[PDB]
Amino acid sequence: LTGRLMLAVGGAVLGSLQFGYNTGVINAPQKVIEEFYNQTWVHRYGESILPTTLTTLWSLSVAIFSVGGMIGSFSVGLFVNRFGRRNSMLMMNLLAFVSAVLMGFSKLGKSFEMLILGRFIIGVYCGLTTGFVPMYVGEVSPTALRGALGTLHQLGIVVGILIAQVFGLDSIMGNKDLWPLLLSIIFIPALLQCIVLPFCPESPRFLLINRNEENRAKSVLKKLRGTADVTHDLQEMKEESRQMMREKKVTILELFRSPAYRQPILIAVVLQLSQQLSGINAVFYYSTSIFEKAGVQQPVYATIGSGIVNTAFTVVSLFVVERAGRRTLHLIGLAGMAGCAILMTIALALLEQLPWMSYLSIVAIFGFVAFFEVGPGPIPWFIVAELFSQGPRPAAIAVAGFSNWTSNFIVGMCFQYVEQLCGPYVFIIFTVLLVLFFIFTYFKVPET
Numbered sequence: 001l002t003g004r005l006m007l008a009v010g011g012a013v014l015g016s017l018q019f020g021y022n023t024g025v026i027n028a029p030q031k032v033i034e035e036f037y038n039q040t041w042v043h044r045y046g047e048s049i050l051p052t053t054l055t056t057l058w059s060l061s062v063a064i065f066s067v068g069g070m071i072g073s074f075s076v077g078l079f080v081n082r083f084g085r086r087n088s089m090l091m092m093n094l095l096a097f098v099s100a101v102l103m104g105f106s107k108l109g110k111s112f113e114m115l116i117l118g119r120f121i122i123g124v125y126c127g128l129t130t131g132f133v134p135m136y137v138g139e140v141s142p143t144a145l146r147g148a149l150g151t152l153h154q155l156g157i158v159v160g161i162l163i164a165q166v167f168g169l170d171s172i173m174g175n176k177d178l179w180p181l182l183l184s185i186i187f188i189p190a191l192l193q194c195i196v197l198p199f200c201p202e203s204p205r206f207l208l209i210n211r212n213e214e215n216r217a218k219s220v221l222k223k224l225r226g227t228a229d230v231t232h233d234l235q236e237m238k239e240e241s242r243q244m245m246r247e248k249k250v251t252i253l254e255l256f257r258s259p260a261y262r263q264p265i266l267i268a269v270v271l272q273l274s275q276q277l278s279g280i281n282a283v284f285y286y287s288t289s290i291f292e293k294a295g296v297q298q299p300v301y302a303t304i305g306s307g308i309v310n311t312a313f314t315v316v317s318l319f320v321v322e323r324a325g326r327r328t329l330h331l332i333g334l335a336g337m338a339g340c341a342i343l344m345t346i347a348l349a350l351l352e353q354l355p356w357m358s359y360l361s362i363v364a365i366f367g368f369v370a371f372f373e374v375g376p377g378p379i380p381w382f383i384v385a386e387l388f389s390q391g392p393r394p395a396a397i398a399v400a401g402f403s404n405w406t407s408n409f410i411v412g413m414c415f416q417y418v419e420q421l422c423g424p425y426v427f428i429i430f431t432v433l434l435v436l437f438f439i440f441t442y443f444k445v446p447e448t
């Protein structure tokens with residue numbers, strides 16, 4: 001709208017791009033980084049790395065990111081209310097630069113420890129970012145536009161996944177020599193945000209409420225909203241303030257202890273479990289590895305195809321979530337992912353008998369990814385926001401986010417263990433989970 005509003009949102013969702021890039025960058029170059037792990041292991045000890053050790057060490061490098069994300073999401077409120085939304089985003093680029101350097105120089109340092117540490121730290125940054133950007137974009141934008149502009153967060157997530165995937169081709173940075181730059185290149189969005197943010201406005205909601213500077217809030221609203229009559233924005237921020245002061249902010253402990261909040265927080269947690277325990281990130285962490293075992297032509301291209309499908313259905317989901325009930329779209333998603341995970345299993349199990357089953361795995365994953373963005377992707381966050389009023393809602397989101405990261409960790413840390421143990425029957429484990437989550441949602445989850 002305004003122009004200065006574009007700059008503020010644009011500089012904010014760079015971190016959304018960061019969130020997606022760091023999510024799906026470790027997929028395509030698994031084999032070349034695993035080779036480095038082995039090359040390091042023989043350099044230190046003289047023997048080749050054990051295959052199960054390489055599985056654990058590489059799983060940890062993928063998963064330690066989620067351990068960091070749980071901590072950062074948990075620390076969002078600490079930073080956002082003390083330093084502001086804009087200054088916290090600026091400040092936290094320190095985390096991105098520290099992580100780019102640890103991962104960028106891990107090969108020079110011959111240290112998978114550095115890489116794992118960098119993965120942990122860039123995790124903390126992303127858990128903080130996925131709290132910062134929605135708040136800032138939501139508080140900086142007009143009321144009529146704050147809904148549409150909010151979608152740029154998840155748009156930047158999926159676009160950044162796609163960029164990391166494309167950058168993972170052997171033809172560019174996804175190879176033996178340039179994979180440290182592939183992990184390290186996040187400093188370019190980071191440096192770019194450090195330059196833009198000092199020119200972005202602080203949140204008017206933050207200046208008016210958290211710091212009690214009405215006149216500075218008014219001045220920022222004047223720049224964000226070109227017209228001089230910003231009293232409607234001021235009154236709404238005051239009207240939202242009075243409504244937010246009507247309820248006492250429930251703590252996490254109170255949420256679990258109160259029989260009035262024990263059931264709604266159950267629906268919210270299980271719905272976050274249903275998003276990650278669907279195995280969505282088996283795809284975005286390991287699709288290149290699983291496509292290779294599926295005999296796919298060129299796995300990295302099939303991976304990129306999933307990220308293209310992921311972006312297309314994220315864009316498609318934005319126009320469908322407000323045209324159907326949360327309950328229906330979540331079950332449709334869980335059901336589609338269940339069938340695609342079945343097709344994935346029959347293709348994996350009939351590959352030795354039929355070579356063209358490699359193409360069926362590409363179709364299974366494309367639809368597995370497609371059904372996710374329409375249901376299990378966004379909907380767990382819709383119900384939790386509509387299950388709770390302003391009083392308990394912050395604590396409920398914090399608990400939801402901790403359930404998300406925790407089950408993300410489980411998949412990314414354990415998928416390869418149950419892969420070398422179940423073979424072509426790994427995705428039935430996801431079908432069994434999806435089906436349980438399906439009957440749970442059919443019985444326990446109300447429609448909002």
Ligand SMILES: CCCCCCCCCO[C@@H]1O[C@H](CO)[C@@H](O)[C@H](O)[C@H]1O
Nearest residue numbers: 083084086087088090091092202207216
């Ligand atoms: C480079 C590391 C990250 C730096 C982030 C902290 C910036 C500290 C200064 O903040 C600014 O102080 C002014 C004077 O009090 C306020 O007018 C303004 O609202 C506030 O934004």
Ligand SMILES: CCCCCCCCCO[C@@H]1O[C@H](CO)[C@@H](O)[C@H](O)[C@H]1O
Nearest residue numbers: 023134153154158281284310377378381
């Ligand atoms: C302020 C926005 C609130 C609604 C957000 C809706 C979009 C949620 C998308 O889910 C994300 O999908 C990625 C793959 O696409 C996964 O890798 C990631 O683990 C998962 O969390």
Ligand SMILES: [Cl-]
Nearest residue numbers: 084085086203
């Ligand atoms: Cl701010």
